[PDB]
Amino acid sequence: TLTYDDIVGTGLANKCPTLDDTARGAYPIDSSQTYRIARLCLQPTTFLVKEEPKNKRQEAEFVPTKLVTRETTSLDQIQGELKVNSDGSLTFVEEDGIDFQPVTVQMAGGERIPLLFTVKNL
């Protein structure tokens, strides 16, 4: 088990926990029980921006960008209710957490695209 001092400055704090390859199981849902997500974590690996179409009005594509705001991008410690619905579907209702990060990515040619990467009120 790792401490703050093991992790601090390594970049691991911006990484979501992972599971090993053996974890291909199934988590039973009891429609009589109440559920919650205690921790939801989102770790972006790629930011794509839709190019502003020349004026040909064809399919404008999402193009790669370079992250310039460093390892400050992940959403974490997000919690919320996990409703079991009549039809057996599950609905996560986000209540709180670190559910946003400002992010600046840089386009080819230099254009910087700030965005509020978020799942607020998910």
């Binding site: 020349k54 004026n55 040909k56 080819a108 040619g109």
Partner: protein
């Protein structure tokens, strides 16, 4: 003395200073190439190769 249009004839029997002058000329030309490339990069819009290419 030398007329103005003959000032460089002093290099004719001076291979070392002729080499110096050629070096200076080459330096000027290469400096031109660099600065020209820089100005074009400072002005070129790469956003539309179809209807706004470099030759436009």
């Amino acid at each position: 003395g030398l007329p103005w249009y003959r000032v460089h004839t002093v290099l004719i029997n001076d291979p070392g200073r002729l080499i110096a002058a050629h070096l200076m000329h080459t330096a000027l030309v290469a400096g031109w190439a660099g600065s020209m490339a820089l100005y074009e990069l400072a002005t070129f819009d790469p956003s539309d190769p179809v209807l706004n290419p470099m030759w436009r």
